[PDB]
């Protein structure tokens, strides 16, 4: 037993590139919270997990508040629900297992996915002509949003 309770450097390995791994993110979704994993591998990568590593399960599933681990799924959309929070956690594990080596990982990501571009409307209505006027606002305070089509 090393008995190193303190007084050292602890951990000495790096998550470098040029290796088959997993990457979970979120983009391009219309007002209903989701996620999107990505698998940049080759030659029959195996199944993977997607746990719900929360304290009280605010990042809920639809009917039963499940984790629903995938199987040979690279990109999907975990259409969750929202039981009153603005922060989460997600322990994600993936048995890679390329060739004669049971390759695994466990990344405990912390994605929080409240909306940003909070948009309100107003119409005006004249005789046989019609106009909307759209209000555009950022749901967070003093973190800015750039915007380049509408």
């Amino acid at each position: 037993c090393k008995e190193s309770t303190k007084v050292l450097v602890k951990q000495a390995h790096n998550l470098n590139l040029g290796e088959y791994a997993l990457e979970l993110k979120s983009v391009q979704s219309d007002a209903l919270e989701s996620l999107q994993v990505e698998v940049e591998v080759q030659k029959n990568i195996g199944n993977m997990k997607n746990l719900p590593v929360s304290f009280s399960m605010d990042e809920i599933q639809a009917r039963k508040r499940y984790n629903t681990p995938f199987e040979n799924v690279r990109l999907e959309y975990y259409l969750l629900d929202q039981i009153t929070a603005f922060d989460l956690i997600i322990k994600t594990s993936f048995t890679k297992k390329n060739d004669q080596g049971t390759f695994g990982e466990t990344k405990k990501v912390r994605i929080q996915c409240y909306l940003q571009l909070s948009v309100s409307v107003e119409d005006i209505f004249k005789k046989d002509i019609f106009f909307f006027k759209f209000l555009l606002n950022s749901s967070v305070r003093e973190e800015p949003v750039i915007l380049y089509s509408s």
Partner: protein
């Protein structure tokens, strides 16, 4: 500053690019610090009493009007004055250097008027 416009005599349901043209000066040599300088565009009724940012049923536009210029060269700018149910408007600018209050340093007097039938 000059103000280059398409027409002064537009009907109601029509879209107009407005084009201000600004000329930074030799006597910008006092500062050089904020190369970016924030203007505004304010719309007056050609009686008194300018319309608010929420120009409801009067004039319509694309984006916030603040629309920065350089202290470098002849920058241009634009809006899209989608007119609605009006007559005899007025456009003029001011220069604000920053975003805060009491940042405003000059008020130009170039007042191009247009009519709406």
């Amino acid at each position: 500053v000059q103000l280059l416009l398409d027409e002064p005599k537009v009907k109601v349901g029509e879209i107009i690019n407005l084009k201000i043209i600004t000329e930074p000066t030799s006597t910008c040599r006092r500062k050089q610090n904020s190369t970016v300088n924030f203007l505004d565009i304010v719309i007056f009724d050609s009686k008194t009493s300018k319309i608010l940012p929420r120009s409801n049923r009067r004039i319509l536009y694309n984006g916030s009007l603040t629309k920065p210029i350089s202290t470098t060269k002849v920058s241009e700018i634009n809006l899209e004055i989608i007119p609605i149910e009006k007559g005899r408007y007025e456009f003029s600018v001011c220069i604000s250097k920053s975003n805060n209050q009491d940042g405003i340093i000059q008020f130009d007097s170039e007042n191009v008027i247009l009519s709406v039938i």
